[PDB]
């Protein structure tokens, strides 16, 4: 309270000034190269901002970076705070049309390309950054007050057309300055994993960079028992963010891929206590927090340190509000909820809040209002979550009333994605699911209509993130004797070689899907592949890699002949 105020929080760019001036020698950045300090990592980012500022010398412009995480990605991060702009990620894994939309709606002036690969850019005014010029020798930086835009974030999309939610300076440093619920030191090693897209990924690089520690980027490839415990072991990460189905995953595959963690967060979705507490009990030191948050409110709302007691429950607590903000539980009236185990909608305060929606004003009036909180009236988001309180006065999650999914930690309105296959032409109807198999989730989809009029089209047009797994055509969406579709009938309706049929009795049971002669438009994604890989590394295998034998390989044809090439089809059932 009064920390709910946004001006009692620093510039990330003042903070992270600070603590390069504190701590020149500090590792700031670890990769496959090497380290830079925090002198080096001022240097070069103040070097690109004197470029930045060549070009946009008015505060305020959106400007992009693409490329995985490497040392000119962060650098370029930092150089476009320095000038007092705000950073958009373009996902170049991503179709056109989306990207120039993201574009379109922030105005994004420029991106700045550290892809290390050739950028098929083709529409969108793309510059290298590696080797550039070194421009004019020096700027003064504009001296910005914290309510300035750092960078943004786009609503799920699923209408086709996504929002941007600007987050602002103080929204970061608010995340990252006085908090309990993790211990931010210079000692720090921070896993830069999350995709920059979303709001993970502030956590994982400010809270190294805003208190002295250290960015361990994974340039090693998509992340998994391996490649996890090579960022630890080589490269010394204590800390990280995981979101809760990876977090399922690796803990299935190898809980100790886990060892060497100092602290843990998980969150995105509603964690699995099974998996949470293998973790646990395999490191009973292991500072584990269950982090909660909508992007409106800029990464996290409410965090809990989890405890011994809470493996008993039904469900992890989400705990309480961070430094910075402040969280009310509303009844259907609009009065606050002051008593456990009665369930009301959860509402957001303090320095976290978001802009807006950008280019929305219906949304934005609907979820950020006025409230009043304590005395005084402040401004609020509705988050739109249902919890509850406990005996202790925790916060425990119960879900939503309206049609939104969390998808592997990925934000989708459904209703408005179903509606958008329902508008496809020869479609009569749409029926989209999320599964809970494995720890993780699919997203499946049936639709009735015409047998040539698969939404290929719409399919390319789609984010990745936002594609169904498995696309089946049916005879009708089964209808219960109350008009409501039947999920269980659905997912029910849902369910040859040597060794050609042996593969496709393992994809079935592991994907819940169908046999006959493709893995990802049979219901695989990218962490059911992981697992599917692992199993075929546990059979006399490692050669066969995340890359060579699915997605190379994807058809069973190509697989049956990829398994058959080393190993046999059953032997994979019991490992
Ligand atoms: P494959 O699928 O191709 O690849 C696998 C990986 C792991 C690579 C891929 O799936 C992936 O990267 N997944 C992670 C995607 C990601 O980085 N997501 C961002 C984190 S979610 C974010 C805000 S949000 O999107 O708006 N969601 C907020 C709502 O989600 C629910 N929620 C959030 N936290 C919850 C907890 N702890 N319990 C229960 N529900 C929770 C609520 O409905 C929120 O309103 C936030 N900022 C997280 C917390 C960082």
Not at 105 to 120: A, E, G, K, Y
Not at 440 to 446: D, E, P, S, T, Y
Request: with cysteine; net charge negative; aromatic share 6%.
């Amino acid at each position: 309270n009064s920390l709910l105020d946004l001006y009692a929080h620093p510039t990330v760019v003042a903070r992270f000034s600070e603590m390069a001036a504190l701590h020149p020698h500090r590792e700031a950045i670890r990769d496959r190269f090497g380290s830079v300090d925090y002198r080096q990592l001022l240097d070069s980012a103040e070097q690109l901002s004197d470029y930045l500022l060549e070009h946009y010398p008015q505060p305020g412009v959106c400007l992009g970076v693409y490329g995985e995480y490497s040392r000119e990605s962060i650098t370029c991060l930092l150089a476009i705070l320095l000038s007092g702009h705000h950073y958009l990620y373009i996902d170049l894994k991503q179709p056109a049309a989306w990207n120039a939309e993201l574009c379109r709606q922030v105005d994004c002036r420029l991106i700045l390309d550290c892809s290390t690969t050739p950028t098929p850019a083709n529409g969108l005014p793309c510059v290298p950054v590696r080797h550039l010029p070194a421009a004019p020798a020096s700027v003064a930086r504009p001296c910005f007050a914290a309510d300035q835009i750092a960078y943004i974030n786009f609503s799920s999309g699923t209408t086709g057309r996504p929002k941007a939610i600007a987050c602002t300076h103080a929204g970061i440093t608010r995340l990252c300055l006085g908090q309990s619920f993790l211990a931010f030191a210079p000692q720090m090693r921070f896993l830069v994993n999350s995709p920059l897209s979303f709001d993970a990924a502030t956590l994982e690089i400010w809270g190294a960079l805003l208190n002295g520690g250290c960015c361990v980027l994974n340039d090693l490839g998509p992340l998994d028992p391996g490649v996890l415990r090579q960022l630890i072991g080589e490269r010394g990460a204590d800390s990280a963010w995981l979101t809760a189905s990876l977090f399922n995953t690796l803990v299935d595959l190898d809980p100790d891929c886990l060892g060497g963690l100092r602290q843990l967060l998980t969150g995105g979705d509603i964690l699995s206590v099974p998996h949470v507490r293998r973790a646990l009990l395999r490191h009973p030191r292991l500072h584990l927090v269950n982090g909660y948050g909508p992007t409106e409110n800029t990464t996290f709302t409410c965090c809990h340190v989890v405890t011994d007691d809470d493996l008993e429950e039904d469900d992890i607590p989400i705990g309480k509000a961070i430094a910075g903000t402040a969280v009310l539980l509303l009844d259907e009236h609009g009065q606050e909820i002051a008593e456990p185990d009665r369930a009301g909608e959860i509402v957001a305060f303090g320095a976290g809040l978001a802009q807006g929606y950008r280019n929305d004003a219906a949304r934005t009036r609907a979820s950020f209002v006025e409230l009043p909180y304590r005395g005084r009236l402040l401004r609020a988001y509705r988050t739109g979550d249902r919890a509850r309180y406990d005996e202790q006065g925790r916060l425990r999650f119960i879900g939503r009333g309206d049609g939104q999914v969390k998808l592997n930690g990925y934000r989708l309105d459904l209703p408005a994605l179903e509606q958008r296959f329902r508008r496809q032409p020869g479609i009569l109807d749409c029926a989209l699911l999320v599964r809970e198999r494995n720890g993780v989730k699919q997203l499946l989809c049936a639709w009735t209509g015409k047998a040539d009029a698969s939404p290929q089209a719409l399919l390319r047009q789609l984010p990745t993130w936002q594609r169904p797994h498995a696309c089946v055509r049916v005879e009708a969406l089964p209808l219960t004797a109350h008009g409501k579709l039947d999920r269980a009938a659905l997912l029910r309706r849902l369910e040859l070689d040597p060794d050609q049929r042996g593969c496709a009795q393992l994809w079935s049971e592991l994907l819940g899907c169908e046999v006959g002669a493709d893995f990802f438009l049979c219901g695989g994604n990218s962490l059911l592949a992981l697992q599917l890989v692992a199993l075929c590394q546990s059979a006399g295998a490692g050669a066969n890699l995340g890359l060579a034998d699915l997605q190379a390989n994807s058809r069973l044809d190509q697989f049956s002949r990829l398994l058959r090439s080393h190993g046999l089809a059953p032997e994979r059932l019991l490992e």
